[PDB]
């Protein structure tokens, strides 16, 4: 060992006798504060291990050969012009046979009708080799269920209609403006981002059926359509690509470099911090963090309010920290309930300064069992609550508007088909709101308090959130991954190139 | 009380011994194989010396019997990756090559022992090799289990008797 | 009354991290006190058993 | 981490306001800053410190003797011990040996040895390897006593192979030139000088010189087989030693004196004799001793008071509180040294230490070196140290410091008439410590004032303090040098591929990145 190493051992052990021996009375008062500082540095290194970020890597692409017949599913509104015309020619140029099946909003969001229309379009002819879907290019909402985008309901109905038929063809899901590769590229659409959240889960649940996702630029083009068929038919193991005028890009998760420099933009709380799902699991941990940081008023919101499981227990703890608590029983999905909540409960002396959206319905299931009615319940509060709160709080300069996303959106996990799309939509809303000059942060959270993914201790998780808020951290991914077992299990379900830039994951498979 | 035939042997011992005949040459020539501590194992060879036996963490011994090539191993032969080999205890690695050689010296094709009632009885202790490369902590567990010093031989050669 | 008898001791045991801090002078005890072989041999020593441990 | 670095920045600058945020710290902080200051000072001296060591290596199953091998054997020994077993080992390893017996006079002469070689290998084919046992004669050269027969024969053999134009690689073998452990006996300086020469010959003529190999005291078929095994083997190792234990390879390793406790105190008392004391390193030694409260200093040199700057050096030393005496004396003359040790050393200030820094520079390439040029260099370097050691036996000395050089430690081109003398001093120190005397051989790098292809000049303040620490720890052979391993390891490996710096992590990192 060295003399510097021996010094820190005496500091951590809190051995005053050995400390003065390691160097050449006043040490009694110094030692506890110094050992406490050394403890916070060990927790900071553990916090640095939790940080990751989704990035877009440029990749080189040269006349790929297409085989068999390519069933191109498309909405009835866009058929006859735009992307559907140029994609049909690009597959014909490469060798394939296009079968452009035009489908309306009603048959598209129903698996029985969609499967019957696919069966009729294919007819007695040979089974298709690929199925290129342009259904996500519909920006409208589902009839009667406004929180369910047409893009999501159609994509879910398509994968399950194909499973009902058992065609064995590879399903490539095409989209436009669902992802942003270079930041200033443009903000994403929440309706189309939900499709990626769905798609990553579909990729792990049905690996053979699902081929991947490809994002397209705004204007249709012959050269872009040629590059689209080039990556679908080509020998590229990339399941998440995005095409632009610049070239081809691929989605990659990577560790965010450690801060190692003072974050001189301290999280200054005050006024009123609105927290949805405050009585719930993650909501209660956020309330503890805010009251300890020195908040003035914490307006906790939930469907239960004071008549919750541990509301009286939580209020009696929170009061001792130094902040006024006012919990409420109001549903974040109803717009009229949120309008009256931002006036009756929030006082004038402490205006709304920050919003922390953590509300979600406890529904989860396999792709086969999902339905549009089941998706409305989840997206009513998760996405619907976020847009209602944002639109009404425009007449107020907010400090922060954090949205609680999840690891299910960032990389995906089986069984999160009615969970990951809503989280992916929040990520898209955050970058759309930052483009409007407003503060927003979509945190891809891990489990709090599934194999490989270790549970985050709430104290370390709220510290990572605080440091991300202090920095202008756009879309941070905070999760404790055991890359060794996680990267192997993820590859066993579906072999992917997404965890290529993480050295730990790249090594695990070799 | 039937006599038991020794039909093959193998060994690696200090002083350049890698075979029974090499060991014979060592004792027939009356050679002393004690030599300086290894210099490629991260040991503080200079700092650890002290003639006082009561000095903590120190030793008054400067020379001993070593296999200065203890880390040399044909990992590929046994289908072991370079990264598993680094995290693998050299005691397991030495036993794998010695076991192969001992079967060969017995006139036995080691691969024809697959599916036979061949037992493996090994004397060994845990000596702290793992005091780890990325993507090989799982390999380090079985790679450093004392039970696997015998078990890995039976696994690698498909021996069915007890290990 | 088992002292001097042909009593064997067969123990299945693995080394754990009890000792990586031991009392001064007790270093000799730490050696035998954490040897997996002594988990069986100690029984034979304490009870004077003469079969293998 | 940068947070730990920012903590030390506030501690070293002694900023209390910054440290409390990142009081009871007021009394603690200057004690902590002082400890951190002392550790930086210790770290600066330790970076300069190395030592030569012997790495035990695994015995390889060496390749067969590829081709005809010329074994140059001296006549004095004749077919008896080592020559009989080495020839039998080359024969049994699948090679054809041709023994060549040589006279002491023929071995020393360049042209005569070359003629004898062309005579012996005339009818047969051109050899692929030459194995010289000429270094095994311990006698001195006739007429030139300071030149050993071993160094002269090895010099004549290498330069004769350039004249003849043979491609065969030369492996020079010795016995007792190096000591691999404490149990191993002290090194014979006449044979250690061959190693000093061989490292230089290795760099100047990389293809011609294969390497050096030391043998145990007794001869046996077992070691002879090991010998031809390493000569005919894959190679890489150009400095090996064979013992009962096995095979050893020469290495340089860091030797930080931080954890090593300070045994004994450097208290310069009585008279401290310093050869070469009027100029160069001896002048910096004189300044160092007078600062440490030396009583009397006897500065010697073959010019004495007439040396440049001797007039103001004596003034500078007496101002530092030290009695001084400067005398003109040829250290190579035993009578002059005996008269100096009786007339110049006062009764009230008896001799307590000797610092041998005397030498005469006569640099030249191996092709231009002769025994005559070697005698002048070795007379004062080795001879002077031998005379001063033998004449101060009855006196009880605290230390006897021999100034060696990095040219001996690893070598450089052009130092063929400089490194052997320094290597003989290192072996002499081992012989004197075996007799129970405080000898110390210091492998010095270049000094500021008096080649930067990685080797930086040592600052006299750091150099003297590193020497003082080594003396205060009974270090036998300290190597003090400032090396930029990022450039030196590559530059030395380009001149000749060696694994000598394998155990210096900075040097091994530089070699891998290439």
UniProtKB/TrEMBL annotation, chain B:
It comes from the Bacteria. This is Putative polyketide synthase. It comes from Streptomyces lasalocidi (Streptomyces lasaliensis).
């Amino acid at each position: 060992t060295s003399a510097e190493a021996r010094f820190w051992d005496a500091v951590e052990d809190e051995d005053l006798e050995a400390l003065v021996a390691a160097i050449g009375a006043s040490w009694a008062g110094v030692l506890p504060a110094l050992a406490g500082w050394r403890r916070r540095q060990r927790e900071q290194s553990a916090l640095d291990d939790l940080r990751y970020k989704v990035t877009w890597k440029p990749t080189a692409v040269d006349g790929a050969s297409a085989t068999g017949t390519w069933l191109v599913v498309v909405p009835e509104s866009l058929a006859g012009g735009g992307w559907p015309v140029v994609v049909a020619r690009a597959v014909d140029q490469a060798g394939g046979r296009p079968v452009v099946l035009s489908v309306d909003a009603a048959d598209g969001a129903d698996r029985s009708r969609l499967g019957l229309r696919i069966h009729e379009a294919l007819g007695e002819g040979p089974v298709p080799d690929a199925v290129v879907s342009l259904l996500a290019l519909d920006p409208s909402a589902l009839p009667g269920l406004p929180d369910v985008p047409q893009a999501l309901a159609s994509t879910a109905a398509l994968v399950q209609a194909l499973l009902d038929l058992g065609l064995e063809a590879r399903l490539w899901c095409v989209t436009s403006g669902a992802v942003s590769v270079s930041g200033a590229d443009g903000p994403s659409a929440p309706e189309q981002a939900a499709v990626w959240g769905f798609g990553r889960v579909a990729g792990l649940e049905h690996p053979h059926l699902w081929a991947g996702l490809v994002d397209l630029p705004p204007e249709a083009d012959e050269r872009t359509a040629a590059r689209l068929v080039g990556v679908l038919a080509g020998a590229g193991g990339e399941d998440q690509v995005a095409l632009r005028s610049s070239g081809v890009f691929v989605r990659r998760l990577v560790r965010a470099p450690a801060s190692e420099v003072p974050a001189v933009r301290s999280w200054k709380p005050g006024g009123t911090v609105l927290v949805t799902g405050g009585t719930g699991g993650l909501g209660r941990q956020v309330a503890r963090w805010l009251a300890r940081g020195g908040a003035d008023h914490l307006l906790l919101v939930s469907r239960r309010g004071v008549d919750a499981p541990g509301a009286d227990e939580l209020v009696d703890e929170l009061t001792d920290l130094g902040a006024r608590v006012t919990v409420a029983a109001c549903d974040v999905a109803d717009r009229d309930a949120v309008q009256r909540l931002l006036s009756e409960q929030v006082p004038s002396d402490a205006p709304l300064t920050a919003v922390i959206h953590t509300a979600a319905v406890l529904d989860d299931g396999v792709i086969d069992s999902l339905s549009p009615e089941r998706m409305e319940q989840v997206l009513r509060v998760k996405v619907g609550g976020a847009v209602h709160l944002y639109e009404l709080t425009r007449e107020s300069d907010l400090s922060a508007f954090v949205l609680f996303s999840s690891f299910g959106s960032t990389f995906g996990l089986p069984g999160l088909g009615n969970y990951a799309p809503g989280n992916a939509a929040l990520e898209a809303l955050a970058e759309q709101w930052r483009a409007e000059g407003r503060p927003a942060t979509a945190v891809g959270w891990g489990t709090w308090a599934t194999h490989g993914i270790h549970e985050l201790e709430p104290a370390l998780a709220t510290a990572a959130l605080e440091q991300a808020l202090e920095r202008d951290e756009s879309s941070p991914v905070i999760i404790d991954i055991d890359w060794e077992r996680f990267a192997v299990a993820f590859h066993a379900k579906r072999p992917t190139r997404g965890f290529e830039l993480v050295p730990e994951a790249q090594a695990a498979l070799e | 009380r039937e006599p038991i035939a020794i039909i093959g042997m193998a060994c690696r011992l200090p002083g350049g011994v890698d075979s029974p005949e090499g060991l014979w040459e060592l004792v027939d020539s009356g050679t002393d194989a004690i030599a300086g501590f290894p210099l490629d194992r991260g040991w503080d060879v200079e700092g650890m010396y002290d003639p006082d036996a009561e000095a903590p963490g120190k030793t008054y011994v400067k020379e001993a019997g070593f296999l200065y090539d203890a880390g040399e191993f044909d990992a590929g032969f046994f289908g072991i990756s370079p990264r598993e080999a680094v995290s693998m205890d050299p005691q397991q690695r030495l036993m794998l090559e010695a076991s192969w050689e001992a079967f060969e010296r017995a006139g036995l094709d080691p691969a024809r022992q697959r599916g036979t009632a061949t037992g493996v009885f090994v004397g060994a202790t845990a000596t702290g090799y793992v005091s780890v490369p990325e993507g090989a902590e799982g390999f380090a567990i079985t790679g450093n289990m004392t039970a696997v010093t015998s078990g890995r031989i039976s696994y690698t050669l498909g021996l069915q008797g007890p290990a | 009354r088992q002292r001097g008898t042909a009593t064997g001791v067969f123990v299945g045991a693995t080394a754990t991290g009890y000792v990586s801090e031991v009392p001064e002078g007790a270093e000799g005890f730490a050696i035998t006190g954490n040897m997996t072989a002594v988990t069986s041999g100690r029984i034979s020593y304490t009870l004077g058993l003469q079969g293998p441990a």
